[PDB]
Structures are given as C-alpha cells and as structure tokens.
Design a protein around this ligand. Structure first.
Ligand SMILES: [Zn+2]
Lengths: 97, 49, 137, 218, 36, 64, 73, 94
RNA sequence: GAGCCUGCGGCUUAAUUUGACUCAACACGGGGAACCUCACCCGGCCCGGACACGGAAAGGAUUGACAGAUUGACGGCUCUUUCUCGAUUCUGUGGGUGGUGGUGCAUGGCCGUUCGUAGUUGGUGGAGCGAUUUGUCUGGUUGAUUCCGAUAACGAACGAGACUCUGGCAUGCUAACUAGUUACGCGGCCGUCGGCGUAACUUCUUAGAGGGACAAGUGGCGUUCAGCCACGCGAGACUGAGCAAUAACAGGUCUGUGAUGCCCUUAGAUGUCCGGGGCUGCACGCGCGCCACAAUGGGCGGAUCAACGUGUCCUGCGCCGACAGGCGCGGGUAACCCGUUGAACCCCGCCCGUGAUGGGGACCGAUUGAAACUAUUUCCCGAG
C-alpha cells in the first residue's frame, strides 16, 4: 500500500540504504518486495572549454548520474515513522508514499 | 514607472553569479554562465567521463 | 490479415469500401494535397477509398488511435528548399474525415480510453476480405 | 513545488555550490575547510568544518547563530529548517583549502613570499606523510613570468586516482602591485577506513604478505 | 597577415621578454636574492 | 609486454611461496588472490599471468 | 528495436538458437551437435552473436572518425 | 533618497529585531521579500544599508547576487537611541 | 566552380561597435543581435554623487503635476501655475561610486598551443678547474628511458602503464503491477488479438556484485630471456573515451565574473532608464557549411523500424480548417502521459524518360508569438 522510493546519485550510498531498509523491515516480519532498479538518468552538458573564443574547439561533456531504487511494501503506516527515522543517510532522499 | 516589461527574450534571463547575458546554461534549471558553470561543475555533481 | 500481402489487402479492401457507397467522400477530395510535405495532387482519383482501407487496417494491429496518431503514420520527408529536409506530419482534416467516414459504417467505434478502435463487425468484414484474398493464390 | 527529479537534484547542487561561495568569503580568515549537508524532508541539517571552532562563533555562540539567520533568508528556509554547527577537522596538515587560506593572511602581513611557501611546505611534511606542492606566483606573463614551483614528495598528475589522493586548492591574494594566485596540491597518505586519507590503495602498488613460517613439517 | 611572424615588432618591444633593470625594481622580482 | 609493477610483484611471489603455486593460470590466480591483496582485478590477472610463465623457465633451469 | 536489416538478421539468429536449445534440454546432444555444425559451416552469424556496436561521436567533425575541413592561412 | 521617512523606520525595526539583512542586486524589484506590507522597492533598502555601511556601522559581503549585512556592537547602539526602544531588546543573533 | 545564409577584410555611413589573423583567427567569443542583449550613433529624463563641515533652516531647505503650451512620449526636463508633502534632500570645494572605456606587452584564473609524441628531474657515488656529464645505455623487443640485459653507477620520483568510464555474453545468482514473459479465464474474429482479467516466472527489459582475458594453452622464431608471429578452444585475443607530466609562450581572455593593478571618465557622465536607428548597410576578396547540377533519380499511393535525449513546458483525444493554425476536452514534474518515439534512407506498385523537364530552386493574400518598417519565419498560389 506504500511505495518507498530511493533517489541517490552515488551507488555506494544507494546500495547501503536499500540494504538496511529490507533488514529494518525484516524485524517486523513483513511481506516485502525485492528492490527494483529504475533506469539510470544521466544529465549531459557539452560546454566549450575555452572561456572566450580562442581555442581548438574543445568540448568537455559532463555527466550527472541519478539513480532510483523502488521498494514496495504492503503494511499499515502506524509505526513506519520510526522505521524511516533509523534510515538517515547524507546524499540520499527517501520519499515514502 | 521606471519598469519595462521584460519576461520573454534575451534580457530577462541572466547568470545568477556574474550577472551576464552570454553563454547561459538554463537547461535543467541552472541559469549560469558557460565560463562560470565549469567553476561550480564539481560542486553541483557533474563529472567528466 | 497477416497471412496475406498488406499491399494486396489494402487494394482489395479499397474496392469493398467503394462498392458500398456508404462513405462520406467530401467535396474537397480532389483539390487538397494529402500533406504539406507533398507537392502535387495524388494520381489516383479515389485516394479517399484507399486511405480509409489502410486506416481501418491499422486499427486491427493496435487499437486506440485518433487523428493526431494517424497523421504521424502518413508523414514524409519535406523538401525545405535549400534547407535540409525534415519529417513533417500529414493533414489532420483528411485523416479526421477518413476516421469519420468509417464511423458511418459499423466498422469503428470510439473507446472510452481515447482514440478509435474496431467493432465486432469491423473485424468480421476485415478477416473475410483477408480470407478471400488468401484463397486467390 | 513538485519539480521533476532532474531539476530536483540540480537545485540541490546549486544550493551547495552557492553556500560554499558564501562561506568562502565569510570564513576565509577563520579557516574554512568544507561543509556537509543532510537533505531531509524534516530538517535539512548543514554543518560547517573550520580549522578553529572558537573563531567561527561569536562572544557566546553569537556568530554561529547570525549565519543561520542569513541562510534562512536567502534560500527561504523556515525558522527551524537549517542549523549550523561547528566541527574541526582531524588535522590541518592535509586540507588544501585550509593551507591556501592560511597562506593568504601571511602574505597580507608583509611576510616574504619565499619564507612563507617554505613554511607551509614543512607544515605538510610534519603533519602528514606524502609531499605537496605550493605554487604562489605569476604563471603566464612576460614580466611576472616567474613560475616559482616548489614540488616534492610523490606528486601525481595523471590518471583517475588523482582525484581521491590529491586535492587542489586555487585561491587569490590581491596586493598593492596586483593579485597573486595560490596553487596547492597536497597528497593524502593511505589510511584504511579513516578520514585522514583515502581508504583505497594506489593501483600501482602490490603488497605481498610474508610467507608462512611452518616448522611443523612432520 | 605577415610572412615572417617571428620578428622584432615595435621599437621599444621585442620578441623575447626583457626587463628595465633585469629583475630589480618595484614591480618585478629577479634581482640579487641570494642570502635570504 | 608487462611493466615493472607486475614484473616486480610476480618475482616476489615465487621467492616467498613456492610449495603452493602451480603451472596453471587459474590455480595460480586463486592462490595469488588469497595471499596477495591486489587492488585491481585486471592487474591481479597480469601478475598471475607472468608467474605461470616463469614456472616453465624455473622447471627448465635456474634463473638470475 | 533496430531497423529493417537489423531485425531480419536478428530473427534468423533467434530461431536458429531456438532449436539448438530445445534439443539440448530434452533430446541427445548428438542430434544437437549435428545441427550446429551444419549452420556454422554456412554462416557464422547464424548462432554466434556479433558484439559490434556504433561508436560514439567525437566533437570536431561529423561522426566518430571524420573531422571538419581545416583552413590553412 | 526620495521618501525615506516611513520606509527606513520599517527597515531599521526589522534590522534591529533581526540583525541580518538580505537584498538581491536588482534595483527594479519593487517588492522586498522581508517587507511586503509596504510597497518599498529593493533600491530603498539597498541604499539605506549603503548609508549605514559608509558610517562604519554595518559590514557587507557580496555573494553571487545577494548582499549580506552584519551589524556590530557599535552599530546596534546607534539604532537604540534612534528607534526609541529600551536596551533590553536583543537582535536575532541571540 | 554555381546558388544561398553565417564569419572575416574593404568600402560606405550619424554609427554601419568589439576580440582574434599559418597550423595555434575567420557557424569562434554558444555572437542563430527586429526593442531589450549593445559595449556603437543621433538625441531626452534619471542620481542610483553614499558618508565627513559648513553655508542656506520649521516666520520651510526640498521632488512630484495630462489644467495649456511644449514634446518623440499621458518625460513636468524647460513656459504659464496652483498647490498639497515637512529636514532624506539641494546647489559648493574634499572624497566615494559606476563603467561591455584603454592597457592580456601590468596580473590572477582559465583555455589553447609547443606535444601526443615518450618524454623529464633530483639524492648519494664516479669524471672534469668549470659550465656540465654518467645514472637517463651498445643490442633485441614494446604504442611506451615498456621491459629483458649490459653496466660507475646504486636506489628512487613524474610521464607511460595501472586506474576511471563505456561496449561486449550465462534457459546464472539478487530482483521487479512505473519492465515483461509463459499458462489460465473471458470476449471479439476466421489461428489471430499492445482486447480484458488474476496465476506462475525473471529468458527478454532495467541495474546492483562478481565471475570472466594473462600472451594462459599449441606451434614456430629469438644466447631464451624480453617478447613477437601463426593456430585450438572461446562472449574478447578487445573497443572507443576521460585523466595526462617537466619546462615554456609577451598566444587568447581587463568582454564571463562583485578576479584585479595603473590610467581615464564621474552630473551637459565613458554611470543607466527610455525612444529611434545601426550591428544585416555594398562594384569586390577569403573561409566554414547548406542544396544541387537527377539515368544509382524525381513525383503519388501503402507498409513496415529507434537510440541518446527533452518536457510547466512536451503533447493526448473530440470538433473546425487548403494548412500554418484555431476552438474545446485530458494526461505527464515523469520506465507511468506524450510513447509499443508507427523517423527518413531503405522496401513494394505507379508515374516520368535526359529535355535546365515533372532535376534544381534563387530571387519575387491566410497564419502564428511581438513591435511583421528593413518584408523574423512559416502557409497557399503563381513566377521560377
Ligand atoms: Zn553566472
């Protein structure tokens, strides 16, 4: 009934959040669904390297990896506030529904 | 008075750092100069690969 | 319909739509070109009866198609003059009147989800025409 | 409100790229070294890392609360949306921006350029393991064309490990005769699971354990 | 353009860098800096 | 053509451990991964590749 | 996915590897190995997949290798 | 300025109650965010702090676009006898 | 070479701003400028000259004003005028501020280039009065002072390599109602069905970790080493990219910065707000590209196919319309909607038949976002 999403940029922090979320719900013996992997969205920025004009037409193409991981749970929302309160991690953002 | 309507066209958008109207990068909601976005590219999260 | 040539099917289906004169065939059928990317008028006089044959055939493959989705099918490479050519959609009116022409017959129906689909009678005549053309050779 | 995730993470980087610029001009002399933010839907906590936690504060926690009143008015935070704390780094001998900032007020106090660069070089060697490089002069010129490069101690310049093993700090010092740059490249030692250095070894290093001393043969 | 770009140029300018006191002055370094 | 980093690390393996390594690349790769902590996986296979090559020389005669 | 020619070469490889998998799971390999040698002898692309992909475009010219015309003087 | 009678007192009462002030570098903004009840432009609050800065009462830092003003122990007493308030009111610093 | 727009020179002009000039300027300063951008030009307001001292001082120092006139303007900036506002203002000498004004041959920073090649440096020791030299090499090999070896050098540090990123293939593991597949039910149709609905599953999709590839086996060549060549087996005998030293350049950038020295300007302004024009002006030169000179093409049908993308602004469906469009009804802040990205080339029929033709198109009322002047561009017809 509640769909927990995990929006993270670095995979190292993302894989650690989805790990403790499954274990954090395992102690309540809940029928949880496995973590799914949404397609990674990269942000392309092709900027000219030179600050003004003079150069050899050199472009530096930046990228920004945005990873999304979903975990579906069907359980009442009575005591899930503390389950999310022990999921503190800088760099990641949890948006429960 | 002393307020001309400028909301559509070159002159309403400017860099949020150096207040310039050239080399703007407003895709994905940045609105930065092309010579200033490179200075903060590592801070935003954009890396070269 | 898949066991036969899709070109021979639309040609045999074009005669069935012209045999029964229950279509619309508007007055401006021979003044307008079928798309802005085209330059001249079609060579065949009864292009409306052939377009309606291909229009109802696409609904059998996938339903829920409207006017904005049919003009994407009938698009081409627009010669922009000295400018490089690009893709340009067809005309919405010539596609809407075709879809409205099929509404006169009991072949298409408007689904609540959006667009137009086929009727139990539309798939009935569509398969028999595909059956009689399969027995031709 | 309800902005797409593409612009949602971009807006987070702008908030950090601009907040660092504000604390760079404000906490320059205080010894700014970095910040860490915790983007949470309840309280977005942001801490400041300075070399002197007693200078960032005021008389009795006065200046630390004054900066909180500014960040709330700029980005539109509520009265309890952000809280700035004071925390010092483990050691100052490996923070590049802390050394570049410490070298600024030295040249502003009439100190010799050569003695100041040699002072910050020995400080990195005394506090740390790997060498560094301090280049404080005019690079490209025809009259200020004095490179004055001070390089020593295992300086890496190419490859991917140049990111998490050596940090570069570029600062400016304007004087009566012009403005001078400060390029500092400090390399961190190998520290396993420690904030002193990277927890990963260099790819050009293969350590072999000693053979097992097994005298019980039969 | 020019056919011989690697040339002198102006009267008071040259292709290579030259100082007025060879480092000494109040705007450049390069003078006697041995015993410091 | 190997480089000095793999050349050096491959020789020290044989000098310290000789009663454990074999003549097969996959078996020598396992023991090299077990005792030696090599950061890269490709570099680890490069060391095991040259270690097995030295075995054909050592079994043929002494080396300098 | 792909184009017209990218699919006509895809389905011929799809049904070729289909029969060699059915004979492997329920029948003897002697029947499976017999049909593999006859297909590879004609064309190698019938069973072995081609890992070729389109290289990325590099700035300075159209495509990957080609470059814009350089103007001397 | 033009009419710095009912606006500056509204700026000083906010600057004294809260010892910080922000103003984006834009002289066309006719509505300051911290002062919305009065139709005071951004130019008035920017030029008001320019007066206090020149008097040696408040220091200013230039961000990307916004200005940050920090009051001092000598500037707070300058506003105490001007706003006619008891010395028992403390700005947002505490 | 032709046609055309974009960039450069020159000419012209009130101005037709400005940086750059072999590679290392010239579809470059994202510079695809109709106002704005704009720095240029002809002209009008504005203080946005804070703060220190005095003059002037509530028996007012002081901006605002369609009462007409004036004017480009309903700009009160000048004329004639009443006024209401009540110590912030005003005209003075100091000092501040602003500047797309000069100097990148004051500078920071950044980028380009030397220079993508395989190239640099010190410690101790040896040689020389010394600058310097050996190490850093006769030979073979390697993309690689990459290694093997030789050795007055020894032991090391940059670069290379390693590393990072990306592509590659298990009826594999871990997973899936924002991705599916195979059963089953139901409905339509004569097997078909992206028609509908719930059961299994993770091959297909997505992305987490770790397995895999080393010149490991075969053979040959090479003091036998370094390695190279050929060949079993195999998803690879691998692919592209990022990063990239030392030292140096009067290379570019004061025009990207609230980086900045000096100088200049500072109220009749080089500050900036508005109006008009220019940056697009042409006998010509150059450069980067577009589209063609069709026989392998063009013209009209129909019919199959997508990847990185993007989205508050993209679009979905009904209705109207020659079409550009317009009128209505919805979804999508996103693997959800657009969307099973129904793209062109290609494919299947027809037409045309070498003829500047149906090849090629320059130049020459109906819209749409504004201010369509200088026709922004599109749409239709004609000319071509
Ligand atoms: Zn900016």
């Amino acid at each position: 009934r509640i769909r927990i999403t995990l929006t993270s940029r670095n995979v190292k922090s993302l894989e650690k959040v989805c790990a403790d979320l499954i274990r954090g719900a395992k102690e309540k013996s809940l029928k949880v669904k496995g973590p799914v992997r949404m397609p990674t969205k990269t942000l392309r920025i092709t900027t000219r390297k030179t600050p003004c004009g003079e150069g050899s037409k050199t472009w530096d193409r930046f990228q920004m990896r945005i990873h999304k991981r979903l975990i579906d749970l069907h359980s009442p929302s009575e005591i899930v506030k503390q389950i999310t309160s022990i999921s503190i991690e800088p760099g990641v953002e949890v948006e429960v529904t | 008075y002393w307020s001309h309507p400028r909301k559509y066209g070159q002159g309403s958008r400017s860099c949020r750092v150096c207040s310039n109207r050239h080399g703007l990068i407003r895709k994905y909601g940045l609105n930065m100069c092309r010579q200033c976005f490179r200075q903060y590219a590592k801070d935003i999260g954009f890396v070269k690969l | 319909v898949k066991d036969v040539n899709q070109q021979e099917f639309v040609r045999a289906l074009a005669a069935f739509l012209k045999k029964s004169g229950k279509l619309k065939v508007p007055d401006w059928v021979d003044i307008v070109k079928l798309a802005k990317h085209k330059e001249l008028a079609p060579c065949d006089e009864n292009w409306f009866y052939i377009r309606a044959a291909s229009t109802v055939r696409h609904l059998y493959l996938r339903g829920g198609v409207g006017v904005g989705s049919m003009t994407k099918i009938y698009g081409g490479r627009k010669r922009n003059g000295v400018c490089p050519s690009h893709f340009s959609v067809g005309s919405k009116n010539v596609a809407r009147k075709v879809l409205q022409a099929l509404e006169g017959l009991k072949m298409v129906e408007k689904d609540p989800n959006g667009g137009r689909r086929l009727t139990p009678q539309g798939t009935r005549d569509l398969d028999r025409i595909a059956g009689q053309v399969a027995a031709a050779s | 409100v309800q902005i797409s995730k593409k612009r949602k993470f971009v807006s987070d980087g702008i908030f950090k790229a601009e907040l660092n610029e504000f604390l760079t001009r404000e906490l320059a002399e205080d010894g700014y070294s970095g910040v860490e933010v915790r983007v949470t839907p309840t309280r977005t906590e942001i801490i400041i890392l300075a070399t002197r936690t007693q200078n960032v504060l005021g008389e009795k926690g006065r200046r630390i609360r004054e900066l909180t009143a500014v960040v709330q008015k700029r980005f539109g935070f509520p009265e309890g949306g952000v809280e700035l704390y004071a925390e010092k780094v483990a050691t100052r001998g490996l923070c590049a921006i802390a050394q570049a900032e410490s070298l600024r007020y030295k040249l502003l106090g009439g100190l010799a350029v050569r003695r100041a660069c040699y002072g910050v070089l020995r400080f990195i060697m005394e506090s740390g393991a790997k060498g560094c490089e301090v280049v404080v002069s005019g690079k490209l010129r025809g009259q200020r064309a004095k490179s004055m490069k001070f390089v020593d101690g295992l300086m890496i310049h190419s490859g991917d490990p140049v990111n998490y093993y050596v940090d570069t700090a570029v600062r400016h010092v304007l004087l009566r005769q012009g403005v001078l740059g400060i390029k500092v490249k400090i390399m961190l030692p190998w520290d396993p699971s420690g904030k002193i250095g990277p927890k990963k070894p260099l790819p050009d290093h293969v350590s072999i354990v000693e053979p097992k001393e097994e005298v019980l043969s039969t | 353009k020019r056919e011989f770009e690697r040339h002198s140029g102006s009267d008071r300018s040259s292709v290579r860098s030259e100082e007025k006191r060879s480092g000494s002055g109040s705007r450049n370094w390069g003078s006697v800096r041995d015993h410091m | 053509v190997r480089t000095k980093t793999v050349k050096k690390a491959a020789r020290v393996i044989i000098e310290k451990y000789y009663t454990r390594l074999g003549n097969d690349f996959h078996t020598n790769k396992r023991v090299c991964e077990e005792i030696a902590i090599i950061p890269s996986k490709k570099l680890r296979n490069k060391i095991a590749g040259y270690v097995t090559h030295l075995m054909k020389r050592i079994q043929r005669g002494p080396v300098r | 996915g792909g184009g017209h020619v990218a699919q006509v070469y895809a389905i011929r490889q799809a049904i070729s590897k289909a029969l060699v998998a059915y004979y492997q799971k329920y029948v003897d390999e002697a029947s499976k190995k017999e049909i593999k040698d006859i297909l590879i002898q004609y064309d190698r692309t019938l069973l072995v997949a081609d890992p070729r992909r389109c290289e990325s475009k590099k700035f300075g010219g159209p495509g990957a290798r080609a470059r814009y015309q350089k103007s001397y003087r | 300025m033009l009419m710095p009678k009912k606006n500056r007192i509204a700026i000083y009462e906010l600057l004294f109650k809260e010892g910080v002030m922000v103003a984006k570098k834009d002289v066309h903004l006719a509505k300051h965010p911290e002062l919305a009840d009065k139709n005071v432009p951004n130019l008035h609050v920017m030029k008001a702090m320019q007066s206090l800065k020149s008097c040696g009462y408040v220091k200013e830092q230039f961000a990307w676009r916004h200005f940050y003003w920090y009051l001092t122990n000598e500037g707070i007493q300058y506003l105490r006898d001007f706003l006619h308030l008891p010395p028992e009111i403390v700005p947002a610093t505490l």
